[PDB]
Amino acid sequence: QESAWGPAATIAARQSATGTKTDTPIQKVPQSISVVTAEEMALHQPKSVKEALSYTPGVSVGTRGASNTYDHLIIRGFAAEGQSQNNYLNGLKLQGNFYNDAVIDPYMLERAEIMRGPVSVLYGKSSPGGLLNMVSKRPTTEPLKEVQFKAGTDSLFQTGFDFSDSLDDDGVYSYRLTGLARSANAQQKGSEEQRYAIAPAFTWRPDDKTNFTFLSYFQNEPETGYYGWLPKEGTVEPLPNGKRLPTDFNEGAKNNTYSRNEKMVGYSFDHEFNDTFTVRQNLRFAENKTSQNSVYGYGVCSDPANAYSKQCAALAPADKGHYLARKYVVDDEKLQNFSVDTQLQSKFATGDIDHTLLTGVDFMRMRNDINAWFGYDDSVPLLNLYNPVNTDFDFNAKDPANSGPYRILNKQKQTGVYVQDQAQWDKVLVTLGGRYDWADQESLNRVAGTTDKRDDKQFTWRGGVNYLFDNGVTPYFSYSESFEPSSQVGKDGNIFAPSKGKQYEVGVKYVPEDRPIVVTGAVYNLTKTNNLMADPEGSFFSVEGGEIRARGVEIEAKRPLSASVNVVGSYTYTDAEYTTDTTYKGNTPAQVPKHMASLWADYTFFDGPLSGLTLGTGGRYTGSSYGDPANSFKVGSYTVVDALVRYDLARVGMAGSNVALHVNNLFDREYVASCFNTYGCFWGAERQVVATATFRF
Template identity: 35%
Template sequence: MVVEGSSAPRRTHAAPSRSRNAAARSRAPAHSSAPAGAVAATVAGSGAGQKGSAFGHVDGVVATRSGTGTKTDSPLIETPAAISVITQAQIQAQAAQSIAQAVRYSSGVRSETLGADQRFDNVYIRGFLADQYLDSLRLLNFGIFAYPIIEPFNLERVEILHGPASVLYGQSSPGGIVDLVSKRPTLEPYHEMFISTGSYGRAQGGVDLSGPIDKNKEFLYRFTASGFDVGSQVDHVEYQRISIAPSLTWRPDNNTTLTVLGTYQHDPKAGFYNQLLPSGIGTITPNKGSYIPTSFYSGEPSFDKTDRTFGTVGYLFEHSFNNNVKVRQNLRYTDLSTDFAVVSPNGSQPDPTNLARGAFTTQESIRSINVDNQLETRFNAGPFEHTVLTGLDYINATDKRLNGQLLVAPVINAFNPVYGAPFGPVPSTTNVRQRIEQLGVYAQDQIKFDRWVALLGIRHDLAQSRTETLTYATGVTAIAPKSDTAVTKRGALLYKFDNGIAPYIQYTESFQPTAGTDFALRPFAPTTGQQEEVGIKYQPNANSLYTLAAFNLIQQNVLTPDTDPSHGIGKLVQTGEVRSRGIELEAKTEVSRELTVLASYTYLDNIVTRTNTPTQLGKHPVVAPMNSASAWADYTFHSGPLDGFGLSGGVRYIGETAGNTANTFYVPAVTLFDAALHYDLSALGPMFKGYSAQINATNIFDRTYVTLCQDIGCYYGLRRNVIATLRYRW
């Protein structure tokens, strides 16, 4: 996939001459809020105009507007917060197969921590596991293995809001959020289909069809469907998915829009548990001169399974009473179920030739409804321009799970595994039913005065939960009700110079409920987070955006062991604290029609500042490296004998990370290289108009590395993966 910007002129001097086919490709029809016609192998259309929507398609890789940081359609250069936007063009150009892969080249982010184990799509921001949202409504994953995985082909963009976001989104991680923006119906016809093949027997394909249903364009539709069947670097592991995402927009007049969206996704083979030994035995350091093969499967092929079904239905409604007042209501119902069974090492035996294992099962389902009501009002008060957003959002969700556990399963030799040894049935151990509710009221004011932009916000939340746990061994049902309230605030100020430079300062807060009770059975209070941030944004034109952010983030009420012996063994208290401090740099620029460049660098000093465990005080939590960096460049020829041909290259550096909470060993740093070749087949003649081909390779030198170690085990990173794609747009 070519990563190419808009067809609008970008330089003051005359553009270089192009071939007839190249000129024809640049005159693709414009689409109002979604992909336009094919230009080379990327999505292109009306140039800078396609960069003008915070919720729609973006031509190329540089977005200029976002709704994630403010819940309003705001220019990124005027939003005093660090926000990264990964467009669908970038996702396709880099052949990202998950949200975790899509954010590889963003600053402040750590993803793909579990390597080939892709049951989860975890993204860490500023050292903390981030919550994920779909169209600004939270994707709930408060269970064990019922985790929502969103197919990236169904999205227009992935947005990362760095830092606490509770003032708009309620309970959330202090590191930030990942907001996924769905593809929506388009005013102009758009059609796309693709097929892919590659490493591990990949078979993949998809279609994306959109446009008006009637001549008056009152009704618009979109239908996105895709699926794949692919193996893995690990023996006996296969991934399968089918995803269907229809949507319909009704526009009864120029002031009203109702878009109904649905999703059905079934992953009958959705991943596996492949955590290896702690302390890096056999992975970072050899065991008797040998390393555990990356192909080693630690489970039982005839027993293990992860079967996930994910369905949603909802709507996005907006009505403008006039130019100054509009209301919005976004609603979604979600049904998610997972059937999981695994035999896995239990970490009690450090000898990889004689791994002790146990078995675990769970059947889990989560049903939830989210609604967000918003009133947006614009008015002037003297020289001040106000955009006031008030809102009320509500979440109601129920998680049911039946868990089973067998402490002892047959041992296995990691260097010479033999499967199929019999073991007893896995008995049911607990039956858990958990219900959560959250009600939030928030207000935000975006104030403009000359070149100044101020952002003020406040929110009040009430979060309630009730957990009923039946333990079969005792026949006792434990009931744990919990109620939390929180007030969170944000204040920020930005100054926008005429030359495109915009420095800003920001203070913002977060809260996140904590499960469990202390020795006196008192529910834990939510963790709280406070962040100070200063930054500079630079937007010299619509095709470039540079961001520098420095932050100091503190999370309090972190759980730590209770050291009072009279309280019993294994009890916890909330006297822990974690500090995250760092610098993030990110650049996205379409230098010319031919050259696109992405770059990022992150310095992160993430340490435990308070704990009752002396061996952890002043130590770095696992996951987040102190230094990480990435760069990606694409060059596409638009004339001469190589017209239509392009090549891309990327490099990712992941610094060393702590291997356990005591920091007694570290996971080594690694540098990975990616590459791509692409060709717009229309350069061969009119009969190939709309066709493009590309080949992507990640970790092209097939580097074997460990991506994460925790106290309980380590994970290998992804090895070389090659994907070839043929795409047709019309």
């Protein structure tokens, strides 16, 4: 009944197309896949997809703490190169570049699915760690007329609506319009967040074998919020005076500004010719823009990073411990992305062996025009952490003695051909597939007049086996590969070769056909080779041949034991380490915790005086982690508790509607989410309380 591209009946999804690009039951997928449903999201009312993943195993949602500027993730100890997202929407990648990275609001999603480990065999170039694939809402079967009001701490105000219906009797034409407007203050003083998004959609079904769904998304964010750096001195450890910087501290200029604009049009098309062939096609064109005027910190004056800062030097050595150095960046980017994935799915048998053959052509073009300016060492006055003074900063005064321009035009293109077969004999299922990619990149420096290019040709494949016992328990194992081009240039003035990803995984999945439960467990060995590292000569350039190894255990469970009880919980153990690095051999990558775990549960009363009342609570534990690649310090572990109070408005004469109270970080725990270096730390989110009223007419 449930479709991999539609809504899931409960908190536990059983269908998914991220792992195979075919509507496949999760037990028959030889890889780890997590699915966060719109229903689960409604439980926590997240502002970003990143927050919605707070309970998902093998995924770290704290690389920026409370900031939701980007949905940047670390999956199984890995992230894309250059601090870029690695997100997909409806099976096509939202290829971003530099600061130009698109973001989709959770209110517009039907699902948020996480794919752990290599996936190039189906998607092309990608980080070894995995990818995020969001699935847009689509026109509903029955009518939908929802209006939602939100009000919470830090002056958060949100109003949204979701409408869907047919325009004719037979249901040949249906539409769906979703929108929201949100204004709120950032956790840190002086910063604000604003978002206005609308998502028009239409589905045309000339016949029962043909579906054409138009999908568009328009979003404007005059202000995306805070995105600065705080030093470890004042966050993880106290300042020389034994005090810490408040969680709402802001080291940026008072006139800092960060904005983003997103425009997307595209469609999803499928047609079944007969029981043997089905054609499927997804395409999207995106034009995203982003601008910022940002003064950010760069750590205290005693920090190695500020070795030769004429401003830090002119300070009493005793004073270097509470003065924070800062820099600025004026950015302005424009990006266009065009993507098309066309598939042919064939179902046929060879004896007792049933087949599902997938062959497709997948390609994308992307260009990003960057016109920025960067301030160097003494480009912005020091900030006295003992007596912080927030003032306007003149971004126009581009002093050539301490700042320079940065105008680049990056172009990327990738075309790939892939084939996959899911052959099943009795209770055995074998997933085999391969993909060949042509990935070309070109970077033109407008200032220098230079131009760097590189054409890559990589082949990747994946094989695995699933055994389906007639009881729901189905063990499995698989081997998958991936590749990730570099954009770095070396001594010889050439772009390096792409690093690679190789993973071995064994696990078990329990999915009973009688009960709505899903439980998964997995053990894996992921390794990234040809990673870039420091030069053994020390020529300010980077060398190849580096290697990082990640291995761990993940177990996730989600299920509605009954009509009044839902349960979600997960556990993650991840041991990442540099196995070959001229500088960090033996260390563990920063921002990567060894242990994580979460448990959530909600109960609903159908009788007694509490009827129509839903109560929930959960906790999320994040192990400790290293604050830099040199492992010179650690970020303490932390535990956060969430709560929920929903009240079905059926008792008062309004079925389908409800009012709720959401609480994140119930005990207002004050913690440092993570640091990527001594001068780059982030406070976690302080307690948040949201009042929600969603009405359906």
